[PDB]
Amino acid sequence: LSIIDVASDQNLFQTFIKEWRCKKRFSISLACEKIRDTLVVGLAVCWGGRDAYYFSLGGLDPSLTLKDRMWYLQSCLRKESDKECSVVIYDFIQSYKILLLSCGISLEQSYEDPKVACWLLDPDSQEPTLHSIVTSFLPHELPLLEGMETSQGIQSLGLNAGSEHSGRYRASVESILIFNSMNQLNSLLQKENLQDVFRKVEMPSQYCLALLELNGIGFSTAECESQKHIMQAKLDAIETQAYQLAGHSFSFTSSDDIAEVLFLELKLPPGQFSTSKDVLNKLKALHPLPGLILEWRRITNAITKVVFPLQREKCLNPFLGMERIYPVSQSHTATGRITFTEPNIQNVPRDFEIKMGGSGGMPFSISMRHAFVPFPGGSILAADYSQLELRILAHLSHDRRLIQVLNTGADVFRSIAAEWKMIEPESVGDDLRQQAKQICYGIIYGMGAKSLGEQMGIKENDAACYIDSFKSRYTGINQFMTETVKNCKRDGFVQTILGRRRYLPGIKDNNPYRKAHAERQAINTIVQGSAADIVKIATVNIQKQLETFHSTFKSHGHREGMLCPIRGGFFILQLHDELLYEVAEEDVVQVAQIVKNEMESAVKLSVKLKVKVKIGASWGELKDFDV
DNA sequence: CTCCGCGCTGCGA
DNA sequence: GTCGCAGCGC
Ligand SMILES: CN(C(=O)Oc1c(N2CCN(CCO)C2=O)cc(C(F)(F)F)cc1C(F)(F)F)c1ccc(F)cc1
Numbered sequence A: 001l002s003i004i005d006v007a008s009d010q011n012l013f014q015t016f017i018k019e020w021r022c023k024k025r026f027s028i029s030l031a032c033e034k035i036r037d038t039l040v041v042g043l044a045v046c047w048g049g050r051d052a053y054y055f056s057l058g059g060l061d062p063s064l065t066l067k068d069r070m071w072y073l074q075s076c077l078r079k080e081s082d083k084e085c086s087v088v089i090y091d092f093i094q095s096y097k098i099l100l101l102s103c104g105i106s107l108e109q110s111y112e113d114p115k116v117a118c119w120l121l122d123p124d125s126q127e128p129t130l131h132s133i134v135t136s137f138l139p140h141e142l143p144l145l146e147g148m149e150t151s152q153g154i155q156s157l158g159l160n161a162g163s164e165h166s167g168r169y170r171a172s173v174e175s176i177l178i179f180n181s182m183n184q185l186n187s188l189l190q191k192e193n194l195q196d197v198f199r200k201v202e203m204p205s206q207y208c209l210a211l212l213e214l215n216g217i218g219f220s221t222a223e224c225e226s227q228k229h230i231m232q233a234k235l236d237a238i239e240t241q242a243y244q245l246a247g248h249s250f251s252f253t254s255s256d257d258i259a260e261v262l263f264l265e266l267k268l269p270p271g272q273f274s275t276s277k278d279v280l281n282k283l284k285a286l287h288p289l290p291g292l293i294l295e296w297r298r299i300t301n302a303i304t305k306v307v308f309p310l311q312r313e314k315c316l317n318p319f320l321g322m323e324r325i326y327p328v329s330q331s332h333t334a335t336g337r338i339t340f341t342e343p344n345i346q347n348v349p350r351d352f353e354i355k356m357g358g359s360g361g362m363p364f365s366i367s368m369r370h371a372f373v374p375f376p377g378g379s380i381l382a383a384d385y386s387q388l389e390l391r392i393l394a395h396l397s398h399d400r401r402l403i404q405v406l407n408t409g410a411d412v413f414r415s416i417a418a419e420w421k422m423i424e425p426e427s428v429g430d431d432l433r434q435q436a437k438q439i440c441y442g443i444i445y446g447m448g449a450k451s452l453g454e455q456m457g458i459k460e461n462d463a464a465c466y467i468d469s470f471k472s473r474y475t476g477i478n479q480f481m482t483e484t485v486k487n488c489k490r491d492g493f494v495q496t497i498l499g500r501r502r503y504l505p506g507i508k509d510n511n512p513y514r515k516a517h518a519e520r521q522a523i524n525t526i527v528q529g530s531a532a533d534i535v536k537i538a539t540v541n542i543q544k545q546l547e548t549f550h551s552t553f554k555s556h557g558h559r560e561g562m563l564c565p566i567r568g569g570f571f572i573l574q575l576h577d578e579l580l581y582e583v584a585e586e587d588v589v590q591v592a593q594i595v596k597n598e599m600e601s602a603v604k605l606s607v608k609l610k611v612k613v614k615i616g617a618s619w620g621e622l623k624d625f626d627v
Numbered sequence B: 001c002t003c004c005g006c007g008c009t010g011c012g013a
Numbered sequence C: 001g002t003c004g005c006a007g008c009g010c
């Protein structure tokens, strides 16, 4: 195709930079090749048609020194008041990282990612690939990717150095394929009214998500190995104690040789012979072994799936003098939530105690949320949304009882256990509060009486009286739920607070399980997704105002090249109703004021949003803050 | 065929 | 190598 090598002639280069400055929209494809590791060889630009303007950064005019080329490169990729420029890149979060870390260019224009648009048009769709966006939106240029089998991988074609094709060809092909496909996706977004969401909350959230990836969460490898050795010892003692409690050895992973010990060798009560966790919690009250196996599964899940993984992905930050974990973002969820991968620092286990030693042992707290530490002379500011997924239900269902218990102040999860266990509300521990939290949310979202009785440890008909009490007590929640399945059946889609549409065609299926899944999924999506929006619209506005009062830097990777006092706040992790920031000592109070002022001013609902700000030297060592 | 929802990950088949 | 089951987390 038309591949203009702009860096070949001096007059040809300056004409490309002149035309580049008149563009209010263009495309980029970072070209990366092997060393013979990654290495940005060049770049690709497109403003229309099948013209690709390769920007070699390594056959070239000697008068165009690399340094003179990099000045013009940053002269066109930086904002200058009302430039109105909107770039289109295939992987914005990783292209913004590679450009900042391998070239020194901190992008400041507007951004448009075709992958985000493909998800915003169908959250249930498959992860977009360049072959999946061309086949669906630009099929008339599909014969271009012929031979380029790398188009079927989520890695950008220009960033896939493993392909035998040159980095120039791979980037030039992608530059025109993503520019024209974005014009088609922009035409579809403008039709469904969702174009504003793509550029006002969604794509600017991926910018904050690219910043947190360069920042990374702190990690204390010494606190991990200490918490590990306490856990392995209890694991080592649970095996020996359990193997004496049964007389013979038995693998805690073989449900066959476990049900033998419990239901047969120990004559424990029971469809039957199930070593499930819902059953072993009921049998926990009869023999020490049903509780020792549940502890074996808790420690093993930690010392294998949160400990050993975290001590693998740890990296050194020589500038900050720390060892920080570098997770990966993933916003491709059906509810709009943001999850993390490699490693998932969202699944870090909660604070749990182990009792080791003679007599009644000795209490030993194991908070694995505690090795995550701030920088020298820093803090970790966490801000909760209280009960966001229930205050939203109050704004939609308008139930006069859910709003009553919301303004009261009681912990309704504890109050559920007070009615369940017939215990004082203040006596409800966290283990029972979490079990009652699952009972609270599941019953609202359509938990059956069979699963309720199995969790509650009571009969099916006994648990059915608890469900029918909820329907009678809270009556506005079901008026909306029956009206929600009315609006999803007539339309075939559920809409969030921002207009995002999840398409549920299974609500008309002939199978009762299939209609129920979509019926249930419709009620969760309208409230789980509306919460992921309220978080996202707050996440962007907090980085916006932190960038206003900005005598600081905006990311640890940004300041890694400018080098100095680390003064500003930083992003690290986002839980589905809680935002964590790594603020610096000097302005712990200012950021906490911005994080909380914006998390409330993010949306305006019937029920005002309550936000609880906490602060400390660890994600587990958190204490309240006044703001 | 089988009835809260979303999400990731290691092991075993 | 690939996917299901089940462990934890919102
Ligand atoms: C019938 N029942 C109940 O009502 O529990 C609540 C409650 N509570 C908590 C205390 N309480 C008394 C007046 O406030 C009340 O109504 C609140 C809510 C929500 F605030 F979220 F709306 C949801 C639920 C529910 F669990 F039903 F979903 C119940 C069901 C299973 C159990 F193990 C214990 C109780």
Ligand SMILES: Nc1nc2c(ncn2[C@H]2CC[C@@H](COP(=O)(O)OP(=O)(O)OP(=O)(O)O)O2)c(=O)[nH]1
Binding pocket: A384, A386, A387, A388, A389, A437, A438, A441, A442, A445, A576, A577, B004, B005, C010
């Ligand atoms: N359906 C469903 N949603 C859940 C479940 N656990 C968490 N969620 C969703 C709904 C609430 C939201 C926040 O979860 P958290 O665990 O932060 O809960 P919380 O009740 O807001 O927290 P707390 O009262 O302890 O501050 O995530 C669950 O088991 N089922």
Ligand SMILES: [Mg+2]
Binding pocket: A384, A385, A386, A387, A577, A578
């Ligand atoms: Mg919470």
